[PDB]
Amino acid sequence: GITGTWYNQLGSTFIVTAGADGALTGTYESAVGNAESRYVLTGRYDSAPATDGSGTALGWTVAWKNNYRNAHSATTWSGQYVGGAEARINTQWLLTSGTTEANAAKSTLVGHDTFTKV
Amino acid sequence: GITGTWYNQLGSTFIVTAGADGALTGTYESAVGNAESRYVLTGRYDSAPATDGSGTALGWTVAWKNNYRNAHSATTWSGQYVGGAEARINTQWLLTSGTTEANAAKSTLVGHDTFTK
Amino acid sequence: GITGTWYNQLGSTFIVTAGADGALTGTYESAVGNAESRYVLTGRYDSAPATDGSGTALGWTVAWKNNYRNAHSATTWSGQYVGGAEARINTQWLLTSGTTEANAAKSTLVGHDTFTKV
């Protein structure tokens, strides 16, 4: 139920395919930041989750470079797929920008995105 | 520069090749935690970073399931590679465990790993 | 706008006094975790924030030790206060537990809390 098109609270578009091998592949489109259009993503998920009602641990990465722009940054999302009536993917993320030594202390942003199919 | 074998402060081994497309592929072996053997990784990196000496942004994911165990979790490392006499990859990571919504507050660990050759 | 009673989404209760000082004092009641009753908090805030509409930066700390219990852990919330009809305090937090240096790779949890007047 992870496969498909999801949207986060910012309006970004997350188009994913969950592979039988635990592979996550698709595209990301950010509604904010130093980005336009679609970027390649790749990630992994637990292809055999618990059955105690636990959610499904997953992760994916986007390097913010494509044919039109390069922000010299990468975001990783970590969280879990929670299926059911209201399916949702709950994440926290790290966005690291390429910096010089002077700026490394402030290289990494952290946040949380919530994805739904609606 | 990135392709190769890397070790972090915990004794884990990160084996990756950086494709020219900006794909990261490889294998991760953790020294600690609910793990044993190798796990598949995949990620992405800035295959055209700035010329000013900034580092190279990158990220990768490991779900902790292989033929041996399944921790029912995934880690994502977000960082940058820095070349030099001492090449380094400095990261921050998020380790999320599957949980019921009751314990979702405690699902996600945060940490930092430094990789070196 | 900061002083008073606030609630997050776990149902925890945050009772603060914002000192002229830049001081934050109060008590925290957490709904979830190895917790019981009220705990002392202390923190700091920008007592001269931007006029330009930006939020009011703040942070606080709770060590989870009181008369009833001691979880040997500490949470810090970092965030910002946002005035308006729906006042909110939007935070990210770090929960560190005391561990041996074996398990220290799993000592710190991260998450986010949104506090509302209701």
Added chain:
Amino acid sequence: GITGTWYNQLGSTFIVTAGADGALTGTYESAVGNAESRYVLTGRYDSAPATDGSGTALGWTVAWKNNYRNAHSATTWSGQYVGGAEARINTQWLLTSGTTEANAAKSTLVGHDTFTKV
């Protein structure tokens, strides 16, 4: 043995006093970012840690306003004190800036500092 003068890898200066009741007070001086001289800090620590060799959980806040400047930001450090030969405090920190609703996705930085007495 938390009271005293500590330095992190950036060469910032962390002067702290741990009171009986679990209080933390002191002064923080950053070697980096939008800061100059000392800023008041405040926090909490577990005043009755385990004895199994586990470290002492602690956390503190700095709002980055003093008589010289104001960055409209606040940093929290969450971590633990670890005694012995190499007495150190290992932390993770969250640095939130006051932003408008629009740029809140980039309000929060994350990092880690290691404090030593040398």
